């Protein structure tokens, strides 16, 4: 991983976001979002990500 | 009504209304218009071996 002062940015497009693969590989300490609600990110599409 | 079970230390933010991950989607949900409040602790000197 980068540094933070020198951070990376990565673009990511023409995939489909199943984030239930991660379940067994990752735990999380933190997860907040912010213009949109977690329950809905199953239903929606992203522009720019 | 008092409900009690186990978890890790990075789940508890899951339990909590509006929230996403393993344990919300498919052991514990609580509806949006809850009334009650939620308690937790570390038990570290009694489930662990
Ligand atoms: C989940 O991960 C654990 C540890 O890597 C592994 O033992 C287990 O087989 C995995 N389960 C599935 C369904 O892949
Ligand atoms: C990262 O990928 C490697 C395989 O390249 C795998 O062994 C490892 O468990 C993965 N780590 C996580 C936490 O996803």
Do not use: H, M
């Not at chain 1, 990565?10 to 213009?35: E, H, P, Q």
């Not at chain 2, 409900?3 to 990075?10: A, E």
């Not at chain 2, 929230?19 to 038990?43: E, H, M, R």
Request: charged share 20%; hydrophobic share 35%; net charge positive.
């Amino acid at each position: 991983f980068a540094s933070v002062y020198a951070w990376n940015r990565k673009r990511i497009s023409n995939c489909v976001a199943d984030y239930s693969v991660l379940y067994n590989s990752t735990s999380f300490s933190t997860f907040k979002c912010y213009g949109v609600s977690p329950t809905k990110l199953n239903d929606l599409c992203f522009t720019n990500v | 009504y008092a409900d009690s079970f186990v978890v890790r230390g990075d789940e508890v933010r899951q339990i909590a209304p509006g929230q996403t991950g393993k344990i919300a989607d498919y052991n514990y949900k609580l509806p949006d218009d809850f009334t009650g409040c939620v308690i937790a602790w570390n038990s570290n000197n009694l489930d662990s071996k």
